[PDB]
Amino acid sequence: PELLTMWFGESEANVREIFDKARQAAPCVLFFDELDSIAKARGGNIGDGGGAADRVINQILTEMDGMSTKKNVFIIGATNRPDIIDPAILRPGRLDQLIYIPLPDEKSRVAILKANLRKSPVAKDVDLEFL
Amino acid sequence: RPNRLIVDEAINEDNSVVSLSQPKMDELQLFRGDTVLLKGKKRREAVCIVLSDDTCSDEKIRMNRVVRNNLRVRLGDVISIQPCPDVKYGKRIHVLPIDDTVEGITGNLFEVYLKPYFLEAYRPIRKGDIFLVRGGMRAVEFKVVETDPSPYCIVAPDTVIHCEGEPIKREDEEESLNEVGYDDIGGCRKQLAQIKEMVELPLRHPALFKAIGVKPPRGILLYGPPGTGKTLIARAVANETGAFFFLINGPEIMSKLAGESESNLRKAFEEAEKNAPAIIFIDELDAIAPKREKTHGEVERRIVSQLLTLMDGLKQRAHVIVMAATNRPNSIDPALRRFGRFDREVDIGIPDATGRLEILQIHTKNMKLADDVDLEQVANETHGHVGADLAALCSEAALQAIRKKMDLIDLEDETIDAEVMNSLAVTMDDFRWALSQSNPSALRETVVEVPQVTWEDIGGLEDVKRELQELVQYPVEHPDKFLKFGMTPSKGVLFYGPPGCGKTLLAKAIANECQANFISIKGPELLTMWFGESEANVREIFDKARQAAPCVLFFDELDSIAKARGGNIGDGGGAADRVINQILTEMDGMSTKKNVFIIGATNRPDIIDPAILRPGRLDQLIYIPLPDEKSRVAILKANLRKSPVAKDVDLEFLAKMTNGFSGADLTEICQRACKLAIRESIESEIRRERERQTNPSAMEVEEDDPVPEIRRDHFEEAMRFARRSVSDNDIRKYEMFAQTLQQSRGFGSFRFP
Numbered sequence A: 001p002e003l004l005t006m007w008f009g010e011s012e013a014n015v016r017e018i019f020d021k022a023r024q025a026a027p028c029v030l031f032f033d034e035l036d037s038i039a040k041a042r043g044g045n046i047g048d049g050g051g052a053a054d055r056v057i058n059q060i061l062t063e064m065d066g067m068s069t070k071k072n073v074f075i076i077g078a079t080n081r082p083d084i085i086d087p088a089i090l091r092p093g094r095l096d097q098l099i100y101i102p103l104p105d106e107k108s109r110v111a112i113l114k115a116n117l118r119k120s121p122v123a124k125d126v127d128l129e130f131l
Numbered sequence B: 001r002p003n004r005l006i007v008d009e010a011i012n013e014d015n016s017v018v019s020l021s022q023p024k025m026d027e028l029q030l031f032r033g034d035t036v037l038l039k040g041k042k043r044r045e046a047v048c049i050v051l052s053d054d055t056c057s058d059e060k061i062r063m064n065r066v067v068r069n070n071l072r073v074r075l076g077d078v079i080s081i082q083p084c085p086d087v088k089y090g091k092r093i094h095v096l097p098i099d100d101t102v103e104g105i106t107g108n109l110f111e112v113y114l115k116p117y118f119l120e121a122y123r124p125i126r127k128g129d130i131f132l133v134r135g136g137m138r139a140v141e142f143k144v145v146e147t148d149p150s151p152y153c154i155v156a157p158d159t160v161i162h163c164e165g166e167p168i169k170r171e172d173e174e175e176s177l178n179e180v181g182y183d184d185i186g187g188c189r190k191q192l193a194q195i196k197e198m199v200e201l202p203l204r205h206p207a208l209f210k211a212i213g214v215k216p217p218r219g220i221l222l223y224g225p226p227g228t229g230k231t232l233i234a235r236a237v238a239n240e241t242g243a244f245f246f247l248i249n250g251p252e253i254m255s256k257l258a259g260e261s262e263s264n265l266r267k268a269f270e271e272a273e274k275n276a277p278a279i280i281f282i283d284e285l286d287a288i289a290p291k292r293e294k295t296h297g298e299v300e301r302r303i304v305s306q307l308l309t310l311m312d313g314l315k316q317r318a319h320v321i322v323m324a325a326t327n328r329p330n331s332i333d334p335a336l337r338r339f340g341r342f343d344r345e346v347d348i349g350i351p352d353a354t355g356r357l358e359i360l361q362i363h364t365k366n367m368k369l370a371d372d373v374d375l376e377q378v379a380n381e382t383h384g385h386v387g388a389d390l391a392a393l394c395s396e397a398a399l400q401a402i403r404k405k406m407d408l409i410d411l412e413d414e415t416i417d418a419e420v421m422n423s424l425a426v427t428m429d430d431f432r433w434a435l436s437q438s439n440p441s442a443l444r445e446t447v448v449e450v451p452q453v454t455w456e457d458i459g460g461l462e463d464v465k466r467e468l469q470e471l472v473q474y475p476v477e478h479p480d481k482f483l484k485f486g487m488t489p490s491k492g493v494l495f496y497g498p499p500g501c502g503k504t505l506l507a508k509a510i511a512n513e514c515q516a517n518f519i520s521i522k523g524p525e526l527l528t529m530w531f532g533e534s535e536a537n538v539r540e541i542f543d544k545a546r547q548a549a550p551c552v553l554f555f556d557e558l559d560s561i562a563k564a565r566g567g568n569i570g571d572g573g574g575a576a577d578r579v580i581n582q583i584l585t586e587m588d589g590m591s592t593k594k595n596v597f598i599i600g601a602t603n604r605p606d607i608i609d610p611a612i613l614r615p616g617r618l619d620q621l622i623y624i625p626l627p628d629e630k631s632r633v634a635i636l637k638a639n640l641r642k643s644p645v646a647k648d649v650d651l652e653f654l655a656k657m658t659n660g661f662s663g664a665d666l667t668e669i670c671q672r673a674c675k676l677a678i679r680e681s682i683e684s685e686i687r688r689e690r691e692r693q694t695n696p697s698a699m700e701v702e703e704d705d706p707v708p709e710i711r712r713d714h715f716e717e718a719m720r721f722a723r724r725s726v727s728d729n730d731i732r733k734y735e736m737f738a739q740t741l742q743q744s745r746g747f748g749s750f751r752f753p
């Protein structure tokens, strides 16, 4: 959401100070939520503001090429739809490792429910794995 | 010392009445309704009848402005009340008016004013006491310079009042009630309470507070529309507390000469610091404190820097507080909002109809009203006005009333007769004329207020109403359960359904039940906000709502974003996405601690963007069914109880012929029936004069069917031509969306755990 907020207007400097701040706090991990949202502007019901998306992508790629090996800062990106996003990112020297997210399955669901129940109440009246 | 009591305002208009609790009355050996003797500064003695009222606390003593000036004390002070119920009857009264209280009157105070003032009042008057009588338009003070017996006496039938002679001169102790006070301001109870809370302590106990050695607030702002009495508020507070109020005006200072304004402002600061614990008031600072980009010139920056440097030199020890007033805190430079600088911010909103009522009452107090008083009706009519507006309205209504009799009265040019001004009374006709030629000021400005919609206005959906009650009232009713389970209440609720179901009415009803302010958002307003000023308006409205918790932040036509973005337009998508992103950011930044609810309503759920369809965002989606048959008549009754109907054939049959009709078309049918009834009454009347134009008086009386009573003919005419508001296929899409959310559910069946 705030990425698309920036998407109208500041698209080049803002990323610059963001990555400068990230570099200063090394070691650190940078996380990106719903990168495909940018391509959602590229591919969507409008498909006309793509210049800003081009600016954002160019800035991101330029900074990634500008990332020195000495800096120890990992970058993670979460995307629901990898197909719409530009494959140009998927190249060596950039995001390369793609990991699928399987659905929770039984024991995973049991552990998730236990973690949720850790808040206060107890569920000693049913079978969690049954559910 | 269980006798001295902290002073408090006396609601009773009687000057010499003080309300005491029974244990204090018994302890001080006082009778019932007798007179007590109070000493204050300079041991000045005042005699006051004990008033039969225990409403005030026993440690408190009800005591109005007149006795406070008699005792040379201020509000929050103490009294020296001592047993003296042996007051003597009056023998002769020697009271003369002050010179500057009856100028331009040339009348007799004794008969016109003093005679009704002292008629069965029995006011204990003491040698040196000050008593005021409020008359036709002014208030006149008097002092008992000398009397028999000494010093006090009782107003009694055996009275000898000498009201003949030159008016007395100034007694040099002031004690004048013509100035301002707390009771002279209305419509700002909460704000006044806050100001008292954060102001009184440093002023009441300066040395004690220094002995505390804790930093007090130093920068306080009031922001709001002009003409709301901010200067009045500051002046009244300063005068009542007791200080050395100092005023500074922007234009009067900045345009003095070159840089001399710096010298003037400095001189003001060290002058104030050299006198006493005081308050320095600044008006229209934005005229000298614009935005940084707005500083086109150079000297303005120098002036701002000088001001900041001077005010920041208020190191810990400072008995002087700085009060500054301006409009909305937008044009003001941001650096002024820092700590040590202006940090406390207060808004002065537009008073409601009730606030207008009190403003009129405190303004029209002096004028003699007629018997056609409809102050409540006027306050109802005067939406979009401020205290200055109402004061001007009253003034020019008085001029209209007086001007009606210029020829009858000998106008002359020398003097006037008090009987003449006493005779004139302001009539409701004068008020109607005054409102006819009037100019409201607020107009283009959003209003914040608790709505007045009650539950019986909307019929049916009681289960949904209870669900909204659970989601809204219960978390603030029982936060204990929520914290015991450690579960956070839902942030907001969304509504979807056919239009004309009064979803906004439901929002207003629940807000009124919750007793919280309401905020309205319009789709046209949002689309206006698309282009140009977009982020700032969203930010300021969110901040205002967060400040005024508890409050209900309502949104209407939320689907309008998709109406212009999606579809065949595809052009305003950029601004729409700007607005949507701003809204999402602001709502995500909101904290559940703040008692603010976000409510969005729509009639096109399918077109809604799915971004909000995420946890933390609007997730509780409620369908609004279309009411047909069942309680429809109840809804009819809800819209029919407004005006009488008397004779009717059947409401159930009326519900029978109609089907699938919302509140909109039902109310439209009711309005059509009323229109036909009005038409019939008007044409029958016109027939009556078209008979009487060539005839003598033919008894033009109530025989015109003017009673509110809709016959079956009007109902039949209404049902002859009445189109269904909703199309069946639209209901099909609504059910399709219901099935869509059922598929998102997927599982609704029952399986045993």
Ligand SMILES: Nc1ncnc2c1ncn2[C@@H]1O[C@H](COP(=O)(O)OP(=O)(O)OP(=O)(O)O)[C@@H](O)[C@H]1O
Residues within 6 Å of the ligand: B184, B185, B186, B187, B225, B226, B227, B228, B229, B230, B231, B232, B233, B283, B325, B359, B362, B386, B387, B388, B389, B391
């Ligand atoms: N709540 C109120 N109670 C009584 N009088 C009021 C109220 N609001 C406004 N008035 C009247 O309206 C006028 C406002 O005067 P004034 O210009 O000092 O107000 P203000 O709002 O402080 O203005 P400014 O914008 O110059 O600071 C006065 O005549 C005052 O008596």
Ligand SMILES: Nc1ncnc2c1ncn2[C@@H]1O[C@H](COP(=O)(O)OP(=O)(O)O)[C@@H](O)[C@H]1O
Residues within 6 Å of the ligand: B457, B458, B459, B498, B499, B500, B501, B502, B503, B504, B505, B635, B638, B639, B662, B663, B664, B665, B667
């Ligand atoms: N007593 C009532 N009960 C239910 N609905 C009502 C009642 N009185 C008015 N309404 C409805 O309130 C609507 C006004 O609210 P509005 O915000 O326009 O709702 P919508 O957006 O669904 O049309 C009117 O169209 C009318 O149908």
